[PDB]
Symmetry: D2
Subunit: 243 residues, 4 copies
Amino acid sequence: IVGGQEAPRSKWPWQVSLRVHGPYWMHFCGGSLIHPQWVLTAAHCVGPDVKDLAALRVQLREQHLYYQDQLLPVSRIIVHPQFYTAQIGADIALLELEEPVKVSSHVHTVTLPPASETFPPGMPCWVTGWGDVDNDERLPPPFPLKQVKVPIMENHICDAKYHLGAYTGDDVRIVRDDMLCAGNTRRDSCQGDSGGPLVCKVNGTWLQAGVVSWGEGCAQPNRPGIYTRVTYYLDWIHHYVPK
Amino acid sequence: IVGGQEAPRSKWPWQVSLRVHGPYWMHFCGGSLIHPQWVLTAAHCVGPDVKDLAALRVQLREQHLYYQDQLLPVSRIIVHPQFYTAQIGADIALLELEEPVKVSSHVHTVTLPPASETFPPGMPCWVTGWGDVDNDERLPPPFPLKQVKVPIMENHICDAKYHLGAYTGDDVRIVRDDMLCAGNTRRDSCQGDSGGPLVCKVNGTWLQAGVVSWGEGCAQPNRPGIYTRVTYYLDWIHHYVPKK
Amino acid sequence: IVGGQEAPRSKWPWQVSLRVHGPYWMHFCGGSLIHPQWVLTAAHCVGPDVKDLAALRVQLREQHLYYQDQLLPVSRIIVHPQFYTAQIGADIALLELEEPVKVSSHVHTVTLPPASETFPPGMPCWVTGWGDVDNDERLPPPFPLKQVKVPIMENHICDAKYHLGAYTGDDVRIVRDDMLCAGNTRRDSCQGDSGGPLVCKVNGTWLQAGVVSWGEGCAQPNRPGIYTRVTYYLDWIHHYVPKKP
Amino acid sequence: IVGGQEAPRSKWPWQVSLRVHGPYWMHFCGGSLIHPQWVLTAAHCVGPDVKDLAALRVQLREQHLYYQDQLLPVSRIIVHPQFYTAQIGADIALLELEEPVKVSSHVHTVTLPPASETFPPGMPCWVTGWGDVDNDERLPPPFPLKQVKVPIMENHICDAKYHLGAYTGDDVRIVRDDMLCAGNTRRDSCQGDSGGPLVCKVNGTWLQAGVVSWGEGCAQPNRPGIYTRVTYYLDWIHHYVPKK
């Protein structure tokens, strides 16, 4: 997270850390708990190439990475079959846990928006994770969960920004209809925040608008964060995840 | 180049090295001379973001990188307006030199194919450059230009191989119609060969079939090298580059 | 620490972490609390060149590096005036804290040995720190304090081992009289353990025998860990550090 | 070499490059040809731990590293038996070549000074090599042999400089009597120049005053280059190397 602060302990009870087997169980991507037995993440975190399930674990919300680890095994990785790269799109995956989690005030699910929900430009949303604090600048120990308020921006405006200082023809889409855009040169997601949630508070309810997907670096001029648009893939999510 | 040998001095007179300004004028991509004033390369080497022309130079064919440098400034970078990433496609760009080069037996242009040429499997094709000799393994000094004969494979076969060990749906095309596929687990292009030529000898004439574009690593199982198909972009090239 | 275990919370209440200012307050060396206001470390951690005191802080015993940091500023760095390199010797330094710390069962001073104590082979000795777990292999998060029991070896035996597979003449001493030797191919200190304590339990009392100084890599054949011999430098320590009241 | 220039092709015909076996025969240290069959170098380049002779080669003077290599095998490494570290001293070694070299105007031996020779402070001397051009800055391709003029400085003055901004007691020797000192914040030897020669022209003859040994970085304030004093070890050298 670029230009963020440490999250209060009470905030973002749905944030999860994805861990890969090595010298230690290292954080590589974020996720959100959308159901007691399901994590929503980015496809690029776990694909497009098939990964060994034995080398993957989920860690539920912890204030500091690695200090109080209770690693959960994954029974199934479901990557959207249309996914190959984040820039093409369908950058969305589901992790099925071997067990449902026992939910509490400190650990519980995020609400998905209805299909009709159109998060208007300028709406204050929050992105959370344990990713880099700037370009090629890792989160220092003790690795606090960070948060940043980012304004949602119209897809057409974000597409136009990605064309400034680029050879790509103005009529050739960079930011596609299954993508959502947020952030500026002070406030953005970064490497290691991938798969984590963009959440917006609507009528007293936190709704997951986005999954951290891609961008040209972090908080670069005219290069806002690109997110998978959750409303676009609700039918695909609901094919696997109970309502 | 993976599984190659050092090129003989007489071979590949169209091979060029692209150089970026830093502590020294460092090789980052290959290219081909297609006209005395024009270099064909990959868009991903010079884009999609607009870069300072003053920090780019072209080096014509040398047997050993850096030893006999005569660096040429660039007047113009022209990147295909459809290009954003190599995997989406249109991975093709043109460099206009500030001056036309004097051609010779040792330094001269490659011939572009006619639109009808498909380059079927079994055709003898070669890829050349100063790129890595394996995954994360740089070409050692004194940096000889390498060559390797790569077997062309049909786009549908290569598309099917890219789906093996992948979550991507079988009917979601990975290897696109503007791309060409070549190489195996012994013979491939690698990092630093990007933008360089894939050339096939057809009726005694060398034709540039491909621009080194992308792949999953180098010489990996079921992951052959992907090249921009030059025949697909001839009309765009001919918009900028004069006929002989 | 090579071939160690995580230290129990009750052990090594004198272990300190030295921190350098950067993107964060990063661990670079170990140390020992020998007085409420004084830390014993290796000279090579803080010298031979004079460094900015404002860029150095001390962290008292923590079970996991960085998790519960209460960083203490330093008023004075005192490096042995004979020190230039660890291999020449006098690899010993003192940090004066700006304030005396409040001691407890969990955080308190280590006892220095009497001048007469030689620490012979067979004596049970432990080395502790947050250093590498092997050659070029960092301690993983969450960075637990590690301990390992190291066999002390006689200086003459260790000197002879350092000459095996070396061009250095047998009568040219490598392991010097102000140094102490401990460890084997399974048990050793490593990069990041430097300045930390080697402690031996003598008649029910923990005594600091050594300061982690140097070696050829970590846990390598015929290359045991070299430590500054504390007994050699007691008079220099007692020049600066007041005796217990 | 820091603050240097590329050597003219006619200069320093005694300069050699030491090569270690890896992906390629990589330069790690310099040396000087003091006899047709003997190279003088720094002990720290080849010790104190015993190295495999099969993994070591010598390359005689070349203008550009790696481009025209003719690698020579070594029959014997002789490291001074007093050597353990450069800071303690005796940082001097001899390589015996398997064959004597055929000498020419372009490749021939440097003259060693007489025991009586005292190179006075301020004397213009030259250090040569393929080492770093600054702190953590490698010599760029095509790796030209570099030279820099450095004034010799009195051991007592150089010892005093190493004590400025240091905790070391002023009466505790850093720069020892078997060492020689040269260079400033613009002009110095660096990593990769180790074992190479410091040469001074005395009565029309180039004499090797020093072997590149150690220092605190390259061209740092009050930290001039430290060299092994050749006059100190003449008797040891002449124990193995036949006199001219």
